Structures are given as C-alpha cells and as structure tokens.
Design a protein around this ligand. Sequence first.
Ligand code: HEM
Length: 153
Amino acid sequence: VLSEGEWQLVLHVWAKVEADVAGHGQDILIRLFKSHPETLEKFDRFKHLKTEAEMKASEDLKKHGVTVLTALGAILKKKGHHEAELKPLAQSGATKHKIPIKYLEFISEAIIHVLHSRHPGDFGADAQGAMNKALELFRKDIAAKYKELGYQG
Ligand code: HEM
C-alpha cells in the first residue's frame, strides 16, 4: 500500500525518535491522556499521577512508553510485512486489555502531534502523509486480527 519512498520517510523520522525513545514515549502518552482522558482509565497504576510532572517522573509510565514505541518501531521497519509482529499485539489489545481501534486512532494522533512538535524539519507534509498511511495500515491490519480473535473493538 505504501511506496518505497513513503516507507523511507517513515523510517527517516523514526530514526529521530530512536534518539530518545523514552522522552518521545512520555510525551506521546501524556498527550494521549490529556487529549482523551478516558484512555487513562485503562491503566490502573497510572492514576495517582495527577500532573504532567508526576507522569514524567514516573519510571513505570516511562517504561511503558518505551515498550509501546519499541513494538511499533519494529512493525514500521517491516514495511507492511508485519503479520508475525502484529499477531502478539492483537492478542494483547483484544484479549488482555480490550483496546478499541478508536483508542489506537487517539494514540496515532498523539504520535503525529509529538513528531511534528519535536521534528518540524523532518516531519513536513510528505513525511506526515507517509506516517499517517503507515499507522492507518497498522490499525487496519490489527482490526482484522482483532476480529479473528473474536474482538469487534
Ligand atoms: C501504538 C500502539 C501500541 C503498541 C505498539 C502497544 C504495545 C504494547 C506492548 C508491547 C505491551 C506489553 C505487553 C502487553 O501487556 O500486551 C502493552 C501493554 C499495555 N497496553 Fe498497549 N500498545 C499500543 C497502544 C495502546 C493503547 C492506545 C492503549 C490504551 C488506551 C494501550 C494500553 C495498554 C495497557 C493497559 C497495557 C498493560 C500494562 C502494564 O501493566 O504494564 N496500548 N502495549
């Protein structure tokens, strides 16, 4: 679905993310919870954290951000050939945490927001478009996996 040129733009900006996975993960999750407070209720250990400073000081939250971005990054690098990497994620969001595609859209929005805020020069129109297509592919394929497992989220 994505051309070679589009994948290169995606992997180019992702390399920037890998310069500080922890920091990007924190900003993305914090942005997620603020723009969509309902998503926070999915994390039990994450609500005695009332302020942005507390969320950033939380090593638990930081660890989770890296776990999330690391998994997404591995998938993006497969350039569409991610069935093997996607299967495990589908099981988690469909059998263990019940994460609807709508929430994946929310977090995709947070990802785009943080990428543009931290890397303007390397995340212009063409790059934003590519990332959007990559994340849409990801959400489409995981939704199909969700259904195979019996989850219509
Ligand atoms: C970019 C998409 C995402 C990726 C790649 C991802 C990846 C992961 C991975 C690798 C884990 C650890 C294994 C597991 O428990 O299944 C995890 C856990 C979890 N994720 Fe997902 N995730 C994503 C999006 C989301 C969203 C949007 C939510 C909710 C609003 C969410 C909520 C959770 C929760 C609650 C856990 C359990 C954590 C714990 O107690 O440490 N994730 N995720």
